[PDB]
Nucleic acid binder design. Structure first.
Lengths: 50, 99, 127, 150, 49, 50, 127, 127, 127
RNA sequence: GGGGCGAAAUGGCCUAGACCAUGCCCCUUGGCAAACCCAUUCGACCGGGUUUGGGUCUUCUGACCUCGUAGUCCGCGCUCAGCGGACUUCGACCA
């Protein structure tokens, strides 16, 4: 996923609960591992026969 | 799987630091608050701000480490690798004669 | 590989096999940008105790947008995503004539003008 | 270091037992790197009740020593011999070597390296400012409390 | 030798990636759930002060 | 002013599953089981102003 | 896909690869009804600490019956099932001549008339 | 190795690379006596956190004297030493046109007659 | 690179430059096995306050042994090591004729039969 | 049990300072992935036990498969296999 911890510094008033971002980082990191998925690829380069 | 060892390491084995953030939070910024619940209304006019200013400063101090961790996250998705090789041979006896 | 030619009326689109596997066949259309294009997922399996079968066919196509023509910096970004899956549960010991009649009925219902209106004008099917 | 007993029972021609004790020095990694230092700026003025701007940095590391010993034994296998204790008793015809060992450990050496987080932390300007303001507020409040007995 | 025909490569996939999941899940049950439980009550506010 | 940094740890022993022989026999006798040692430490850096 | 031609004496049967996978290869015979036909399962793996290998080959064939020729209504139903598995445990560092001799001995034991009698007349092998 | 040809007006001098190294390039002029001749030190590096770069160019030339033409016995002895170092601090993300204009301005200031008078007659630059 | 041809009498050996550096030039002979062969280390520097110079020339050659011809397993293993270093301390302001005479005397002392006997029979030089 | 702390929540002391009370921070380690065995509707049913799990040659030193980790020159060419390849090191049931 292209989210992985929103980051983005921001500050407001009367709507910012101090400990609201703490759980957010961990939740985003947890949801990021579930989306991870490898994707290997191979192609022929060169060869020869003797 | 041995080709992803270092990547998994730098992905999560170092990410435990992020988990260490919530530890200090749960330990101090919500457990030590047992004093606010016992004070009379005459002290809530001050304790609320006393706690809010202390938590906002901690969040601000947290912010840069989150940036470093995010920068480290991008280091794991760099398409870099090498090449694998193999070889195969076979023989077939043709003829033979004594001497 | 495997090429599929689709006629839209005035042009011909070509889909190429990408991920050749038994339990999951992934066809991808090759026109220009590979990301956010036409993809098709096909799957075939069994069920229960070797009674019938199960066929799944999904077709996805996500639109893309770009601002490099006017704005001086914007990578091609996907917008919405459309999912159109299917489900075929046909038993082996059936009837060829019945299967052909069912396929003809499905083709007629697809080619009819009622489903087109239901798709475009979002009007419930009932003419 | 380790001390072992090689009690081997002889064949039917006697059936005795030879202890044969031998020592074997063993290697081990280096001991924990203890640390203990202290520093302070040069004395400016003798007066300490008032004192002058100074600094002090102390670093200490230590690991409590604790020795312990392990041991184990074992011997060869025979055909249905019911006496395979540390020293086999009976003797059908062949010999039994057996063995008993006991090695000691210095736990002060089997400890990984000190983590890299053991360093001085960084404090920003707003941190110091808020910590100074709250301390001054607490001091002024404590002072106000004292003036209640006028 | 050039232009080798279509290859028949087989990759098992499913690398040892589920291991790191057991760490975040285990640690999440020790500090995150208690934190969410405590924050559920008396969620403090903030003002211009 | 002042800045501190603590550190603490423990230590334990856990023998392997067993000492398998080739065609012989072996057993385990007396292991620590209980606690072993301990590590501590504390840093400090204070600067005073009038 | 992958085709295998088997000669029975007067006709030739064709088996087609259906489930192409490394740890499990499933070949199916294509003649008529796909359900209740000839199937072959092949598997190859290692063992222990990179020492030898393990090859498994199973061949199944379930007979079918049908009553639509006389009775009004009866779908093709399977009757019995036969299982003939194998197990090959040959180490890598062996001998080509020994392997060839073992294969020739196995082929001779298969083509001999004693195993045929043991299979047909159920008489224990001992001539 | 690496040769550099310098035109003084009527003759051509040749400088040869002697100490080929990345962080320190030492060019020496080959005419006659190697000791007390023309030397050039070049250095290239970075700065800070990958921001700009740093280039250093020094040119030294020590005069020599000898008395073997008249006096019985005197080895070639150096007299004075001249040091002319440089310092180039140009950032990477700059402008090619601006760099070319700066180089042209530096070349014009070097080729002007004011710096020559400042060097020869030791008169402060101000015409 | 840089090739050096040495004539032993009936065959010609070729040494190739490997580690081209100013303060350390490493030449290695290319014949067969690169490990345990002929190597040459050359170094040139100054001294004190730009008075004289210092040249160092070392020549090493370690013999190798192998048992794969008879014994069924032994990698090529080095035996002994020989070190023959040099030291040249010649001032710059000297004399070309004196240097040529010294080089001729050194060449004569090397080509004489006394040093050969001292090397072979280990007899002290004194004929 | 073994430790830590006076920090951090407050109370004695409370220019300052260093100690105290409740009081708060950790260990009770953990995981193997495979193959086989029971009584029976005389296997469907969960649960248990045994053999293996980087591996051999003299797994004594030391090497022969494999990789992992680093440092060093590196080819811009010589070799039948060719190739991109060289030398030195530490580790190798898993967190």
């Amino acid at each position: 996923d292209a989210r992985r911890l929103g980051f983005e510094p921001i500050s407001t008033t009367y709507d910012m609960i101090p400990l609201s971002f703490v759980v957010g980082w961990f939740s985003n990191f947890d949801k990021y591992v579930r989306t991870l998925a490898p994707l290997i690829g191979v192609t022929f380069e060169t060869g020869s026969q003797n | 799987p041995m080709l992803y060892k270092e990547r998994r390491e730098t992905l999560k084995m170092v990410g435990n630091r992020l988990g260490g953030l919530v530890r200090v939070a749960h330990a101090a910024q919500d457990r030590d608050l047992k004093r606010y619940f016992k004070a009379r209304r005459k002290d809530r006019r001050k304790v609320a701000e006393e706690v809010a200013n202390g938590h906002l400063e901690l969040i601000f101090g947290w912010l840069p480490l989150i940036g470093e961790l995010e920068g480290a996250i991008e280091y794991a998705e760099l398409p870099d690798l090498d090449f694998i090789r193999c070889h195969g041979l076979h023989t077939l006896v043709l003829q033979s004669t004594p001497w | 590989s495997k090429t599929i030619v689709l006629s839209v009326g005035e042009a011909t689109r070509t889909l190429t096999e990408i991920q050749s596997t038994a339990d999951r066949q992934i066809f991808e259309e090759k026109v220009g940008p590979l990301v956010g294009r036409l993809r098709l997922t096909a799957s075939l399996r069994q069920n229960g105790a070797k009674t019938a079968y199960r066929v799944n066919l999904k077709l996805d196509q996500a639109d893309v947008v770009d601002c490099s023509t006017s704005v001086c910096g914007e990578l091609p970004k996907v917008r919405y995503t459309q999912v159109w899956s299917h489900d075929v549960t046909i038993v082996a010991n059936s009837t060829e004539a019945s299967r052909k009649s069912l396929y003809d009925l499905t083709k007629s219902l697809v080619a009819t003008s009622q489903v087109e209106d239901l798709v475009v004008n979002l009007v419930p099917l009932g003419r | 270091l380790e001390e072992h007993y090689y009690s081997r029972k002889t064949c039917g021609s006697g059936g005795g037992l030879s202890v044969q004790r031998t020592g074997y020095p063993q290697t081990d990694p280096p001991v924990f790197k203890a640390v203990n230092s202290f520093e302070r700026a040069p004395l400016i003025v003798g007066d300490h009740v008032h004192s002058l701007p100074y600094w002090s940095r102390k670093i200490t590391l230590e690991c409590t020593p604790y020795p312990f010993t392990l041991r184990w034994e074992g011997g060869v296998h025979k055909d249905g011999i019911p006496d395979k204790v540390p020293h086999p008793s009976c003797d059908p015809g062949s010999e039994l070597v057996s063995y008993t060992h006991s090695r000691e450990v210095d736990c002060e050496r089997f400890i990984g390296p000190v983590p890299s987080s053991f360093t001085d932390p960084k404090v920003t300007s707003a941190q110091w400012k808020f910590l100074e303001d709250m301390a001054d507020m607490k001091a002024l409040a404590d002072l106000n409390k004292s003036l209640v007995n006028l | 030798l050039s232009t080798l025909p279509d290859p028949d490569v087989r990759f098992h996939a499913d690398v040892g990636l589920f291991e790191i999941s057991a760490g975040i899940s285990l640690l999440a049950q020790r500090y995150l759930k208690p934190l969410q439980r405590l924050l559920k009550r008396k969620s403090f506010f903030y003002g211009r002060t | 002013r002042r800045t501190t940094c603590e550190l603490v740890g423990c230590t334990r022993f856990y023998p392997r599953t067993v000492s398998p022989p080739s065609g012989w026999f072996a057993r385990w006798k007396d292991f620590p089981d209980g606690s072993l040692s301990e590590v501590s430490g504390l840093r400090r850096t204070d600067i005073r102003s009038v």
